[PDB]
RNA sequence: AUAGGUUUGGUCCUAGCCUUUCUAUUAGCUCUUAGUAAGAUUACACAUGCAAGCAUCCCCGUUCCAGUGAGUUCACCCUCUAAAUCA
């Protein structure tokens, strides 16, 4: 299917069942349906742990490096997923995510410590 | 294997193009604003509340 | 050097010179029975640009794609004239044969 | 999804989208991030950029692609 | 059948028999012990030299049923039903 | 039984066994052989039995048969850059033909390796999908990661029907 | 200066391979399988003699001893420590290279932990990740129950070494700690109960004597060979012995009373052997029956 | 520099073709001229509203 | 019933009952299934014993009360077993319900991985051709100048406080639409006491 | 297919039909629970609601996704070469 522009993009193709989320790291057309056409699988992720307690990914990385030498766009979970293996530099928002958490669990502990203290 | 024409494909395409370079609007016509209810009349769409000021 | 002609060298028997400077030639190719799994020829007709005039019909010629096709189905030319009917000489030892006797004796030269 | 000619919904025709209230510190912050993280994308993005161009031109025009051509022509003759 | 089933496994050459007729060992070769070359029965009087002439292409009679199921082509939804113990 | 003298040759088994694979140049292969003569046996005899497996092997080349036009069998190949490699197989058996056209024009057991092993990187046995093209589908077929929920119920805690009712 | 023999070295391997011994009929046992009708072929004796060497070259392939390897050392290395990652994730990432033309023991497998510790994987995840992706046949991502001791005393009972040591070659590589911890197991279980004969005719009975030997502990294997009559291997075992332990009492007398034959177990017997009083009543016995034979 | 993983496979790289070398590998972010975002575009591929009016 | 062999399912297998009634063919030897026609469905029932009542042609395992699939029972599973190829026989061969071969598989591989039941142990190949632990995937990696300094990877995971006079363009540009500023965040993650 | 029933007073041959196996819809009668997958007969006509926005204005997007199977060798390979992605 002859899209109207568009670009090669790696993307979480979502498999499985209900409740049961997995995920195909692939490279496909823009435009092309979420779990539809794509040009080559480049991976896999697992979101929920295992017996050992693991999220597992896999990454090709050989052929990731082709398909971003080759123009390929990253969506914004895929760019998240390298930043956590080191292949890419951390997301800024990944920290700054931190952040807004490490401030949250900060006012968190005011509250606790009042009730705690005053009563 | 022979395609058969399609000609009022063709046809109705180049009409459409005339069409779109005698009737294309004015800058005057696209860009203008009601400074009131902050729309374009030209389409009727509401600019950014972030333009407004 | 590269053409759009999918056919790039193609062997077949002229089997029509009406039309001018163009040879029809009679290509056949061995074709696989999926069920007999026996090959039987398949044949196809080809244009051939024959700007000299000089194919035969019944003689065996060689066909060379051309660059871009020169006319509706005109998409090769000849590349050589392999047997000619009835003047066939032999290319193991180039003698002039006349079926499978020698006209004039490989001997005769030595 | 709606097609450009699907008309517009009655019940939309008075929404406005309200932007965000933005946190002066953690804005720039974050600004500034970006403008990081992207440069350092942009690098890593040339290189793999320029290992898919030096694998193809070695697999045309290489020393080894052209002695094995080589090689193939002087066993056929 | 009855007739035909006993003139079949009648008439059957034994692989002694084999090895008599044609003076050569009969190696079997079982694929579940890998190459190790059986030797089922040996000449009992004396062993030829000359190894038995190795046609390149069998001029022998091929049952089409065989082929056909050979090359995947013969479906039968009747084939290899699972049946009792017999 | 299966029609014809030499049936064999009709068959998938046969034909895979041919040990000729052209090399890209080889465009056109004319055999010219001799009906009767026994000088001409082997070309009768490569024409009957190897033929086929030629072809198969060589689906896009195309192969002429011509019949009692010359004095002795040969073979002419048409090469894509235009030179004609003419073979003569008088006197020689149809096995000597099969090697000798090998030697000349066919790839080499290291050639036709390399292309098997570039086959192989085709499929990857990391990679999830359809049976057709991948190994395992689902990823809840590797031991130790959570099973599928056909089989094996999800704990009530792991399943959006109940974390909406604890939360509400 | 003069280094000790590696158990890959040509002499080595010439030495353990003649021990070893090679029956074409254990080599090739029956295996129960699903089966197929057998084939025939009619053979002259020059054929057959032929088809029988062919075996032989079959089943020295068959019998290649794996490599003994040393254990390999934990890998405990830390890529990054990003901190700020601290607390974000409950649970840690374990991301595989799965790049096709890759060694696999040159690939990168790393753990991003909760803390934010960027860490090379272990060597025990590392090997549950490759048959994750690369699976292996006869490999179990969860370690079979069959390795636990009560499990494996009952393969030991039963005289079912060899599939022991099969199993464990399938699912532990060489250099792990279960690999080499089940593969000593087993060969104190053949040692103790004097089933030498269970590994020869095998790919494992170089690794047995190897182990025999740089433990000090060949008696047992001396005696069940000069038992069955196999005095060229006992001698080159006690050979070899001297060749891995050299500033040994036993090389030494062997050496100062230049022992050869039949006499370099007589000066290992009494010198170095715990058992020296046991090999010299078989090796007697040995000896009087070969020289009734003789006559 | 390079992040955590692509360094640790360029010094891998290095070690196993015999380089020896103690030099980190870093990426050139020289050429990489990062403009704001408000830098003005290029009004000439900007495309143009069309004729339906309302 | 109530059999007496439950806690030890193998006597049952070594006493005279069992003799008398099998001998030395298999238990299976004589169960015949009822079923029109020639060719049999390809499935067996379901259960032969449903709400602790017996159908009419109880399977072999059924109908004896004393026979217990147990992966201990390793001369009754073995019954179940091709004793030339190793293969258990699906259920139609033997005539067992579904619910007993399914049974019956799973204490056959029980049996098999705690050692009980002998079958085929292939000899493998190496995984690896090479055993080399020296490349770097394995080995340690040069630790980078700013592990070593205890620095973050990029100078720009840390939190800098933007300059005054930048946030003050920032509410200028935000009039009305602003948030409390956030300070520098915490240094490290806290939790609830 | 491992086959079976059926021509005749009877036998043999040939032959069609049907039986036994495995699925999918619909109908009758009947039906406890959990998880999962799947789910108009009709390219007939459609009440009502919703399904495309975003954004400091320009642009961009609404040409995708989703739907259907009416029509029907435009789908594949090669040659050549636009638009598009690689700031
Ligand atoms: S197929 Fe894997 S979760 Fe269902
Ligand atoms: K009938
Ligand atoms: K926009
Ligand atoms: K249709
Ligand atoms: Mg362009
Ligand atoms: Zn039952």
């Given at each position: 299917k002859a899209y109207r522009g568009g670009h090669l993009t790696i993307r979480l193709a979502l498999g499985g069942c209900t409740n049961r989320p997995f995920y195909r790291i692939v490279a496909a057309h823009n435009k092309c349906p979420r779990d539809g056409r794509f040009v080559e699988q480049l991976g896999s992720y697992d979101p929920l742990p295992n017996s050992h307690g693991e999220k597992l990914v896999a990454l090709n990385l050989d052929r990731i490096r082709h398909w971003i030498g080759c123009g390929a766009h990253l969506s914004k979970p895929m760019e998240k997923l390298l930043g956590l293996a080191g292949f890419f530099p951390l997301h800024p928002m990944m920290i700054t995510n931190a952040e807004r958490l490490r401030r949250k669990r900060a006012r968190e502990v005011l509250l606790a410590s009042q009730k705690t203290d005053a009563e | 294997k022979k395609v058969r024409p399609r000609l009022i494909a063709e046809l109705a395409r180049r009409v459409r193009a005339l069409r779109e370079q005698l009737n294309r609007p004015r800058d005057s016509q696209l860009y203008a604003v009601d400074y009131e209810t902050l729309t374009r009349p030209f389409s009727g769409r509401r600019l950014p509340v972030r333009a407004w000021a | 050097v590269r053409s759009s002609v999918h056919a790039r060298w193609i062997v077949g028997k002229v089997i029509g010179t009406k039309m001018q400077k163009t040879a029809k030639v009679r290509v056949t190719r061995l074709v696989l029975d999926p069920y007999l799994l026996k090959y039987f020829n398949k044949r196809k007709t080809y244009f051939a640009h024959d700007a000299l005039q000089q194919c035969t019909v019944g003689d065996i010629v060689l066909l060379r794609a051309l660059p871009v096709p020169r006319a509706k189905h005109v998409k090769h030319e000849l590349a050589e004239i392999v047997f000619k009917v009835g003047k066939?000489?032999?290319?193991?030892?180039?003698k002039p044969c006349a079926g499978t006797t020698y006209l004039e004796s490989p001997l005769s030269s030595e | 999804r709606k097609t450009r000619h699907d008309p517009l919904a009655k019940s939309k025709i008075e929404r406005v989208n309200m932007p965000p209230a933005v946190d002066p510190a953690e804005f720039f912050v974050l600004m500034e991030r970006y403008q990081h993280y992207r440069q350092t994308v942009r690098a890593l993005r040339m290189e793999f950029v320029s290992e898919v161009q030096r694998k193809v031109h070695e697999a045309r025009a290489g020393v080894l692609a052209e002695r094995k051509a080589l090689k193939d022509a002087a066993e056929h003759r | 059948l009855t007739q035909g089933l006993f003139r079949g496994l009648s008439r059957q050459e034994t692989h002694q028999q084999l090895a008599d007729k044609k003076g050569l060992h009969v190696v079997e070769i079982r694929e579940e012990c890998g190459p190790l070359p059986i030797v089922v029965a040996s000449p009992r009087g004396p062993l030829r030299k000359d190894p038995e002439p190795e046609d390149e292409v069998p001029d022998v009679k091929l049952d089409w049923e065989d082929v056909k199921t050979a090359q995947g082509m013969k479906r039968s939804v009747w084939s290899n039903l699972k049946r009792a113990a017999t | 039984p299966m029609k014809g003298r030499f049936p064999i040759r009709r068959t998938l088994q046969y034909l895979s066994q041919g040990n000729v694979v052209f090399k890209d140049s080889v465009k056109v292969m004319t055999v010219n052989y001799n009906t009767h003569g026994e000088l001409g046996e082997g070309a009768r005899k490569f024409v009957f039995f190897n033929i086929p497996q030629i072809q198969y092997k060589n689906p896009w080349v195309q192969i002429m048969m011509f019949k009692n036009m010359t004095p002795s069998p040969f073979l002419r190949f048409y090469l894509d850059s235009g030179e004609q490699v003419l073979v003569d197989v008088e006197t020689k058996s149809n096995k000597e033909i099969m090697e000798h056209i090998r030697k000349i024009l066919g790839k080499n057991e290291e050639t036709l390796r390399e292309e098997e092993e570039e086959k192989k990187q085709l499929s990857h046995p990391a990679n999830f999908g359809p049976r057709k093209y991948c190994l395992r589908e689902c990823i809840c077929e590797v031991e130790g990661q959570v099973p599928c929920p056909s089989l094996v119920p999800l704990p009530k805690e792991m399943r959006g029907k109940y974390k909406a009712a604890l939360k509400a | 200066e003069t280094k000790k023999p590696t158990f890959m070295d040509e002499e080595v391997q010439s030495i353990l391979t003649k021990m070893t011994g090679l029956n074409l009929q254990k080599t090739f046992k029956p295996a129960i399988q699903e089966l197929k009708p057998p084939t025939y072929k009619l053979m002259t004796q020059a054929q057959l003699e032929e088809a029988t060497r062919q075996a032989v070259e079959a089943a020295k392939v068959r019998l290649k001893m794996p490599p003994v390897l040393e254990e390999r050392v934990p890998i405990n290395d830390v890529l990054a420590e990003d901190k700020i990652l601290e607390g974000t994730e409950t649970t840690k990432y374990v991301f595989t290279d799965i790049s096709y033309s890759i060694p696999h023991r040159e690939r990168f497998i790393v753990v991003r932990e909760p803390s934010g510790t960027l860490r090379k994987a272990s060597w025990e995840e590392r090997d549950r990740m490759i048959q994750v992706y690369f699976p292996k046949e006869g490999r179990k991502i969860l370690t079979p129950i069959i390795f636990k001791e009560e499990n494996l005393r009952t393969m030991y009972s039963q005289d079912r070494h060899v599939d022991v040591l099969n199993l464990c070659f399938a699912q532990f590589e060489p250099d792990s700690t279960e690999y080499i911890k089940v593969h000593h197991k087993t060969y104190e279980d053949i040692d103790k109960r004097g089933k030498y004969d269970l590994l020869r005719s095998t790919r494992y009975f170089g690794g047995m004597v190897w182990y025999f030997v740089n433990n000090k502990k060949i008696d047992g294997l001396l005696i069940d060979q000069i038992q069955r009559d196999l005095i060229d291997d006992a001698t080159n075992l006690v050979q070899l012995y001297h060749v891995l332990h050299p500033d040994g009492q036993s090389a030494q007398g062997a050496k100062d009373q230049a022992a050869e034959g039949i006499n370099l177990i007589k000066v290992f017997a009494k010198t170095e052997a715990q058992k020296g009083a046991y090999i010299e009543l078989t090796l007697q016995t040995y000896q009087e029956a070969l020289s009734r034979h003789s006559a | 520099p390079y992040p955590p993983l692509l360094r640790a496979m360029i010094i891998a790289e290095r070690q196993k073709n015999g380089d020896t070398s103690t030099e980190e590998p870093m990426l050139n972010?020289?050429?990489?001229?990062?403009?704001?975002?408000d830098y003005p575009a290029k009004q000439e591929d900007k495309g143009r509203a069309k004729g339906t009016p309302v | 019933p109530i059999s007496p062999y439950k806690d030890e399912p193998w006597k049952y297998l070594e006493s005279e009952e069992y003799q008398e009634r099998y001998g030395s063919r298999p238990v299976w030897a004589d169960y015949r299934r009822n079923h029109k026609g020639g060719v049999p469905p390809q499935r067996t029932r379901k259960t032969c014993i449903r709400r602790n009542k017996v159908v009419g042609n109880p399977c072999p395992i059924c109908r004896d009360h004393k026979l217990h699939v147990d992966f201990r029972n390793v001369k009754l599973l073995e019954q179940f077993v091709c004793a030339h190829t190793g293969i258990i026989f699906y259920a139609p061969y033997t005539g067992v319900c579904v619910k007993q071969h399914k049974r019956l598989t799973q204490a056959i591989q029980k049996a098999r991985d705690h050692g009980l039941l002998i079958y085929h142990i292939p000899q493998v190949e190496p995984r690896d051709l090479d055993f080399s632990t020296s490349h770097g995937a394995v080995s340690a990696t040069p630790p980078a100048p700013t592990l070593v300094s205890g620095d973050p990877w990029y100078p720009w995971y840390n939190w800098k406080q933007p300059p005054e006079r930048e946030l003050s363009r920032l509410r200028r540009l935000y009039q009305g639409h602003l948030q409390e500023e956030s300070g520098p965040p915490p240094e490290s993650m806290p939790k609830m006491p």
């Amino acid at each position: 299917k002859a899209y109207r522009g568009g670009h090669l993009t790696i993307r979480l193709a979502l498999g499985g069942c209900t409740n049961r989320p997995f995920y195909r790291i692939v490279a496909a057309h823009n435009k092309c349906p979420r779990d539809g056409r794509f040009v080559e699988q480049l991976g896999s992720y697992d979101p929920l742990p295992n017996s050992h307690g693991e999220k597992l990914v896999a990454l090709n990385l050989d052929r990731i490096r082709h398909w971003i030498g080759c123009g390929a766009h990253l969506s914004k979970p895929m760019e998240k997923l390298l930043g956590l293996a080191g292949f890419f530099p951390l997301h800024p928002m990944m920290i700054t995510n931190a952040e807004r958490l490490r401030r949250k669990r900060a006012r968190e502990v005011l509250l606790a410590s009042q009730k705690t203290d005053a009563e | 294997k022979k395609v058969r024409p399609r000609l009022i494909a063709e046809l109705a395409r180049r009409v459409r193009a005339l069409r779109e370079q005698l009737n294309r609007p004015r800058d005057s016509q696209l860009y203008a604003v009601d400074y009131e209810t902050l729309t374009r009349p030209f389409s009727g769409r509401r600019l950014p509340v972030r333009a407004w000021a | 050097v590269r053409s759009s002609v999918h056919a790039r060298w193609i062997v077949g028997k002229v089997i029509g010179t009406k039309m001018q400077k163009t040879a029809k030639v009679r290509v056949t190719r061995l074709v696989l029975d999926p069920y007999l799994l026996k090959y039987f020829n398949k044949r196809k007709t080809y244009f051939a640009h024959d700007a000299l005039q000089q194919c035969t019909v019944g003689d065996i010629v060689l066909l060379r794609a051309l660059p871009v096709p020169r006319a509706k189905h005109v998409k090769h030319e000849l590349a050589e004239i392999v047997f000619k009917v009835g003047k066939v000489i032999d290319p193991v030892t180039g003698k002039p044969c006349a079926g499978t006797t020698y006209l004039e004796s490989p001997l005769s030269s030595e | 999804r709606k097609t450009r000619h699907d008309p517009l919904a009655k019940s939309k025709i008075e929404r406005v989208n309200m932007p965000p209230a933005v946190d002066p510190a953690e804005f720039f912050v974050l600004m500034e991030r970006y403008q990081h993280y992207r440069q350092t994308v942009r690098a890593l993005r040339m290189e793999f950029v320029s290992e898919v161009q030096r694998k193809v031109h070695e697999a045309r025009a290489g020393v080894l692609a052209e002695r094995k051509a080589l090689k193939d022509a002087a066993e056929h003759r | 059948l009855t007739q035909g089933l006993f003139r079949g496994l009648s008439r059957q050459e034994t692989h002694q028999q084999l090895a008599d007729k044609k003076g050569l060992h009969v190696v079997e070769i079982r694929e579940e012990c890998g190459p190790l070359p059986i030797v089922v029965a040996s000449p009992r009087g004396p062993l030829r030299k000359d190894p038995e002439p190795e046609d390149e292409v069998p001029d022998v009679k091929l049952d089409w049923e065989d082929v056909k199921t050979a090359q995947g082509m013969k479906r039968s939804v009747w084939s290899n039903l699972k049946r009792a113990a017999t | 039984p299966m029609k014809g003298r030499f049936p064999i040759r009709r068959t998938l088994q046969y034909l895979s066994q041919g040990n000729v694979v052209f090399k890209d140049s080889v465009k056109v292969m004319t055999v010219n052989y001799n009906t009767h003569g026994e000088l001409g046996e082997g070309a009768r005899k490569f024409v009957f039995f190897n033929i086929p497996q030629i072809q198969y092997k060589n689906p896009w080349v195309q192969i002429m048969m011509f019949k009692n036009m010359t004095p002795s069998p040969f073979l002419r190949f048409y090469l894509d850059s235009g030179e004609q490699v003419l073979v003569d197989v008088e006197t020689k058996s149809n096995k000597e033909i099969m090697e000798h056209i090998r030697k000349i024009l066919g790839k080499n057991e290291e050639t036709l390796r390399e292309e098997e092993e570039e086959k192989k990187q085709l499929s990857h046995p990391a990679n999830f999908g359809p049976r057709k093209y991948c190994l395992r589908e689902c990823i809840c077929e590797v031991e130790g990661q959570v099973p599928c929920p056909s089989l094996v119920p999800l704990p009530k805690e792991m399943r959006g029907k109940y974390k909406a009712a604890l939360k509400a | 200066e003069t280094k000790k023999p590696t158990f890959m070295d040509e002499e080595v391997q010439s030495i353990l391979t003649k021990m070893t011994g090679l029956n074409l009929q254990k080599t090739f046992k029956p295996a129960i399988q699903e089966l197929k009708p057998p084939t025939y072929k009619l053979m002259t004796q020059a054929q057959l003699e032929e088809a029988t060497r062919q075996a032989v070259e079959a089943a020295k392939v068959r019998l290649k001893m794996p490599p003994v390897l040393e254990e390999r050392v934990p890998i405990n290395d830390v890529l990054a420590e990003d901190k700020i990652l601290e607390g974000t994730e409950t649970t840690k990432y374990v991301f595989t290279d799965i790049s096709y033309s890759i060694p696999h023991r040159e690939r990168f497998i790393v753990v991003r932990e909760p803390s934010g510790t960027l860490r090379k994987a272990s060597w025990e995840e590392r090997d549950r990740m490759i048959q994750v992706y690369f699976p292996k046949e006869g490999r179990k991502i969860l370690t079979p129950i069959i390795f636990k001791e009560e499990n494996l005393r009952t393969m030991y009972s039963q005289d079912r070494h060899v599939d022991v040591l099969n199993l464990c070659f399938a699912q532990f590589e060489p250099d792990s700690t279960e690999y080499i911890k089940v593969h000593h197991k087993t060969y104190e279980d053949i040692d103790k109960r004097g089933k030498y004969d269970l590994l020869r005719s095998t790919r494992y009975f170089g690794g047995m004597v190897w182990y025999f030997v740089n433990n000090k502990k060949i008696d047992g294997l001396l005696i069940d060979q000069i038992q069955r009559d196999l005095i060229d291997d006992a001698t080159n075992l006690v050979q070899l012995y001297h060749v891995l332990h050299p500033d040994g009492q036993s090389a030494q007398g062997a050496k100062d009373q230049a022992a050869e034959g039949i006499n370099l177990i007589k000066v290992f017997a009494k010198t170095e052997a715990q058992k020296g009083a046991y090999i010299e009543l078989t090796l007697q016995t040995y000896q009087e029956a070969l020289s009734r034979h003789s006559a | 520099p390079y992040p955590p993983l692509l360094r640790a496979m360029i010094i891998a790289e290095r070690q196993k073709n015999g380089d020896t070398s103690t030099e980190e590998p870093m990426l050139n972010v020289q050429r990489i001229r990062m403009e704001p975002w408000d830098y003005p575009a290029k009004q000439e591929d900007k495309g143009r509203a069309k004729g339906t009016p309302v | 019933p109530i059999s007496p062999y439950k806690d030890e399912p193998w006597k049952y297998l070594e006493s005279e009952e069992y003799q008398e009634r099998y001998g030395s063919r298999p238990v299976w030897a004589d169960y015949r299934r009822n079923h029109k026609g020639g060719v049999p469905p390809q499935r067996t029932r379901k259960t032969c014993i449903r709400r602790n009542k017996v159908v009419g042609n109880p399977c072999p395992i059924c109908r004896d009360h004393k026979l217990h699939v147990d992966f201990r029972n390793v001369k009754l599973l073995e019954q179940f077993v091709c004793a030339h190829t190793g293969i258990i026989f699906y259920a139609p061969y033997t005539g067992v319900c579904v619910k007993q071969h399914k049974r019956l598989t799973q204490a056959i591989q029980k049996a098999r991985d705690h050692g009980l039941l002998i079958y085929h142990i292939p000899q493998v190949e190496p995984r690896d051709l090479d055993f080399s632990t020296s490349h770097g995937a394995v080995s340690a990696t040069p630790p980078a100048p700013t592990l070593v300094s205890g620095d973050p990877w990029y100078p720009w995971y840390n939190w800098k406080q933007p300059p005054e006079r930048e946030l003050s363009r920032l509410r200028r540009l935000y009039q009305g639409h602003l948030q409390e500023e956030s300070g520098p965040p915490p240094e490290s993650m806290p939790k609830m006491p």
